[PDB]
Amino acid sequence: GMDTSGKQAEAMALLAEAERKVKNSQSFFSGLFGGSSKIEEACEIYARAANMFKMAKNWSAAGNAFCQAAQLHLQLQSKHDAATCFVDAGNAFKKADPQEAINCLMRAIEIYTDMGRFTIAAKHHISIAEIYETELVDVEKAIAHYEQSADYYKGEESNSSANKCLLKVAGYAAQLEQYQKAIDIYEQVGTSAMDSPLLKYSAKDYFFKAALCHFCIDMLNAKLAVQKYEELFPAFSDSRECKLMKKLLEAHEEQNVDSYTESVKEYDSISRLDQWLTTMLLRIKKTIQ
Amino acid sequence: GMDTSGKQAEAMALLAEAERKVKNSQSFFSGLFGGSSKIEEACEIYARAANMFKMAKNWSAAGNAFCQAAQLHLQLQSKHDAATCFVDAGNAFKKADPQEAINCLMRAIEIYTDMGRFTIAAKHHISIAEIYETELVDVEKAIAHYEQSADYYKGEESNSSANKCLLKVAGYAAQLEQYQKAIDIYEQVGTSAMDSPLLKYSAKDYFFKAALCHFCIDMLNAKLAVQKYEELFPAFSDSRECKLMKKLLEAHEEQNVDSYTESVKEYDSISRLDQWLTTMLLRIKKT
Amino acid sequence: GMDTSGKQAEAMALLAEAERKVKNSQSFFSGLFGGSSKIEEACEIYARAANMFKMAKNWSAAGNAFCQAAQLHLQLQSKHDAATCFVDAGNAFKKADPQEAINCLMRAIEIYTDMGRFTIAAKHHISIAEIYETELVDVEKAIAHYEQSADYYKGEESNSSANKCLLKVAGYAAQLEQYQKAIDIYEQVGTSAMDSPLLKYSAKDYFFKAALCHFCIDMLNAKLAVQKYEELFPAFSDSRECKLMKKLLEAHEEQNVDSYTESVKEYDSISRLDQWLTTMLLRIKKTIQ
Amino acid sequence: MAGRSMQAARCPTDELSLSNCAVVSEKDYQSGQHVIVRTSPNHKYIFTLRTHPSVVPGSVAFSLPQRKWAGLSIGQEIEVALYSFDKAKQCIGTMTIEIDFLQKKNIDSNPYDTDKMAAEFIQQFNNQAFSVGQQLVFSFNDKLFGLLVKDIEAMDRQKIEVGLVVGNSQVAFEKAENSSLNLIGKAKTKENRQSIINP
Known part of the structure; x- marks a missing residue:
């Protein structure tokens, strides 16, 4: 396309013009000492x-030019404008090179939390974690980034945002990490929604996830915990999940895999699985001996 | 009301005295060279x-006044103010004749991009994309605008906004019978929504539409494709969408036009269908 | 209330200071020069x-203070702050005495659409209509205000908001105004909704209302209207409402109160009727002869 | 001849309503003329004219059955042009008319003599235009009946699609399928009878 070719041709011309502008700006500072208008206009060209x-x-x-412009701009004691360019530069690199995007975004976060905005800094932390996990295969840094983000939201009473991230952190920790952290986070979040305005009948699932995690640990802790929720939350007594877990509990007691297999089969037929409960149930069945 | 149209004529006189304000630029600013603010208030009365x-x-x-005011004000200074005037002119030009609104919005896009503000530019790209659809008939230009807007959004991790834009692109492309593009977009979104808890319920629809698109080109590969979806997502089978398709493909093995007709009517008996689905089924099942 | 008592006490003190500031103003328009800044301080205290x-x-x-501050501020060749204070003056007047809120808003409407912005002006138009219908007993001016809001919305391509505005005005007009308009808007919105996948599932209700509006005048052209509708919309034949119409018109041709009354009762048994449709059915029944 | 724009009006009298004739003003037409009424490129309908002093010039009056058959509304603009029949080809030898009580309140089981029906029909509607599918109201011994033209045949045995009823036309009536009507006498078809016996 003509548009592309012309844009690149004038891109190099402008970049060359900017490079000669900055070198002449260094010459003019001593030669005439015009102040700082020479550098700022060169930044505009960049x-x-x-x-x-x-x-x-x-x-x-494109992002390389942004970083150079921001670096020179920050050289003149202007921070917020350079930081915004850092965010813009990092976003452009998102589809070019993750490492440079991460570095610049971390630079933007530290300066922003240096300015004093935490919602923006924590928002960037989610973005860093999202890119970190979506394409690069690793979890531990994502957990740290989300936990830091959850802390910052709670720093300003953004309960809904903190609730979501802590739930996300607990879910992955249960998947790979140990279960104690999942137990505390899942139990705390679930019990903190008994008087929800619209989520009143939604907290049930949270206790169900905890029950499975305790069951994954040991049988005695499974039953003891299951009762504790029964007395604590009356409505959980009549939940369909409560009957299912009780049926699975007694089935596994007598070592009859057929009862367990049919019990899970009927549950799947009535309502669909979630791809996360199935893995936990399969692991449970792996230790029936 | 009627007298406000009377003051509209006086407002044309206000433009007329703005014509005298540019007549100052003809002769009088020689002695009022410092009246750059006089040009500013001239733009204000504009x-x-x-x-x-x-x-x-x-x-x-109103559109003529906005465009003229923007042109006068864009004296290589206060560019953002000129951009606001340009978008206002495009908004005003939306009604009646939107043709010139496209050019003004495109100019605003260039200025906003030059400034680097992605979100406003891409949002305006959507606006010009939808006006094409609802007023004109060209769709390929709309596809190009959606692609550019999606690329801008995807750079800034605005995945959801780009996701919906790509979903609309795939549907239009499917209506334009370029299935490879449609299937790729539908598969990408389908496997991405399932990644997070908040959207795992929606994928069933995405997979169903993708299967139909695959099911149009190569029927033989459809069975392998649906098997791949079933194994990739163990929770894909019982859903009525998968059972319905499995019946349609297996029924087509034998030439029984009846078999499929009650099935689609039976499925329709539980909920109504959309033009997109009904049109595709009518075309595809013809052979 | 002690909190309110001291609140009113300082409120009176500020009024005395404000009375001294208008004295400062008049002493600075006729006695001194450059009072624009001094009266600006008066506006701040106001x-x-x-x-x-x-x-x-x-x-x-509070509303009186806002209006006095605004009108004084209009003299300083400034208009945007005049609009903000006019809107705030109205916002205070919505309760208690709203008659002058209409006048001030119209002035604010005049200024806003003397500046360049529609969506705010049209939003205030619908607000004026809503307050007019809820607390003033008159509907004709509401029709005009909704029509003006409809013109502004649909022009700016905000079709979604326009559609509801056109729908409501047409529906209200059917109650006390000739039904020719009701048919036109209902048909127009139904046809527009047909292509769009959003309202296509619900356009049957609009088609139902249009038939009721047409039926109330005469029977023969109503048969022409319904047959035309199902011809254009084949899937309207299976709609339960279409069966209800066919039974209703067939019974009415027979001049049988019992059959018509039981049929409408049978429809009422499932789902529920509405304040509007019940009146429509009664009105057509009363002229059965 | 060329055609002129006219405004549809209501029939002025009950007597003219039963004539099935489009009522016009003496200043515009003469009684007995036939016109073709145009409402759109695809809708052209033929009527016979009968003048009445009360019709305003520039308007054509139609009865309710005519408006229903013709899809005409009072006050709607129409185009009316004179129509001339080719009597060699458009005279009716036989028409089939579907008949039923106009008002359900006045239904009765008393016999109605079709031979007397046909003679009265000819006396009332002679030299008037009729078309297949046309609807009209017909009065007989002070009883109103709804009529629907089903078939038309030419005068002497060529089949035609449209014709003109004349004095010597012979009409045959056949009861519609699913009709309990009991018909006696001539002026009918009385088709064959497919017995239950097999060959």
Whole structure:
């Protein structure tokens, strides 16, 4: 396309113009000492060239120009504008090179939490974690990033946001990490919604997830915990999950895999699985001996 | 009301005295060279007079005043103010004649991009995309705008907004019978929504539509594709969508036009269908 | 209330200071020069007092203070702040005495659409209509206001908000106004909703209402209207409402009160009727002869 | 001849309503003329004219049955042009008319002599235009009946789709399927009878 070719051609021209502008700016500072207008205008050229370059479908050099412009701008004691460019540069790198995007975003987060905005900093933390897990295969850093994010939301009483992330942290921890952290987070979040305005009849599932986690540990802890919820929360007594878990509890007691297999089969037929309960149930069945 | 149209004529006189304000640029700013603020207030009288037309429901005149005010104001300074005027002109031009609104919005897109503000630019890209659909008939240009808007959103991790934009693109592409693009988008969204708890219930619809698109090109590969979906997602079978498809494909093995007709009617007996689904089934099942 | 008593005490003190500030104003228009800044400070205290009245529960005084501050502010070649205070002055007047809230809003409407913005102006239009219908016993002006809001919305392509505005005005008009308009808007919205996948499942209700509006005038063209509707919308034949119409018109041709009354009762047995449709059915019944 | 725009009006008198004739003003037409009424490119309907002093010039009056058959509304603009029959081809030898009580309140089981029906029909509607599927109201011994034209045949045995009823036309009535009507006398078809016996 003509648009692309022309945009790249004028991209290089502007970049060359900016490079000669900065070198001449160094010469002019001693030569004439015009102040700082020379550098800031050169930054404007960098911003324009970078922003038109990204429109030209090319990304890597676009973010590189943003970082250079932000670096020079921060050299003149201006922080917020450079940090915004850092966020813009990191986002552009998201489809080019994750490592540079992560580094710049962390730079933006530290300066933002240096300015004093935590919702923005924690929002960036989610973005860092989301990219970290979606494409790169690793969990531990994601847990740390989310936990830090959950702390920042609670720092300003953003209960809903903190509730969601802590639930997300607990879920993955249960999947791979040990179960004690899952027990505390799942139990605390579930019991903290008994008087929800609209989520009143939703807290039930939270206790169900906890019950499975205790059952994964040992039988005695499974039953003891199951009762504790029965007295604590009366409505859980008449939940369909309560009957299912009781049926699974007594079935596993007598070592009859057929009862367990049919019990899970009927549950799946009545309502669908979630791809997370099935894995836990299969692992439970693996230790029936 | 009627007298506000009377002051609309006086507002045209306000533009007329704004014509004298540019007549100052013809001769009088030689001695008022420092009256750059005089040009600013000249633009201000333009703006308030520009919309005293926008009182009188004179869409064309209001748009003309906005565009003229923007052109005068964009003296290589206060660019964002000119951009606001340009988008306002496009918003005014939306009614009556939206043709020139496209050019003004495109100019605003260039300015916003130059400034680097993605979200506003991409949102305006959606606006020009939908006006094409609802007023004009070209769809390929709308597809290009949606693709560009989606790319801008995906850069800033606004996955959900880009997700819906791609979903609309896939549907239009499917209506334009380019199935490879449609299946790729539907598969990508389907496997991505299942990644997080908040959207795991929605995928069943995504997989069903994708299976139909696969089911249109190569029937033989459809059985392998549905098997791959079933094994990838163990919770895909009992859903009425999967059972219905399994019946349709197996029924087609034998030439019994009846078999499929009651099935689609029976499925329709529980809920109504959409133009997109009904049209695709009518076309595909013809052979 | 001691909190309100001291609140009113300081409120009076600010009024005395404000009375001294208008004295400052007149002494600075005729006695001194450059009072624009001094009266600007007077406006700040007027806003300072006016709002504090709004916290003192004295709504009427707060509205008066806002109006006085705005009208004084209009003289300084400034208009946006005039609009904000006009809207705030109205917001105070919505309760207690709302008659002057209409006048001030219309002025605020005049200024806003003397500035360049529609969606705010049209939003205030519908607000004026809503307050007019809820507390003033008159409907014709509501029709005009809804029509004006409809024109602004649909023009700006905000079709979604326009559709409901056109729907409500047409429905209300059917109650006390000739049904030709009711048919036109109902048909127009139904046809527009047909292509869109959003309202296609619910357009049958609009088609149902249009038939009822047409039936109330005469029978023969109503048969023409319904047959035309199902011809354009084949899936309207299976709708339970279509069967209800066919039974109703067939019974009415027979001039049998019992059959018509039991049929409508049978429909009422399932689901529920509404305040509007019941009146429509009674009105058509009364002229059965 | 070329055609002129006219406004549809209501029939002025009960007597003219039963004539099945479009009522016009003497200043515009003469009684007995036939016109073709146009409501759209695909809807052209033929009527016979009968003048009445009360019709305003520039308007054509129609009875309710005509408006229902013709899809005409009072006050609607129509195009009316004179129509001339080719009597060599458009005279009716036989028409089949479906008949039923107009008002259900006045239904009775008394016999009605079709031979007397046909003679009265000819006396009332001679030299008037009729079309297949046309609807009209017909009065007989002070009883109102709804009529529907089912078939038309030419005068002397060529079949035709449309014709003109004349004095010597012979009409045959056949009861509609699922009709308990008991018909006696001539002026009918009385088709064969498919016995239950097999060959």
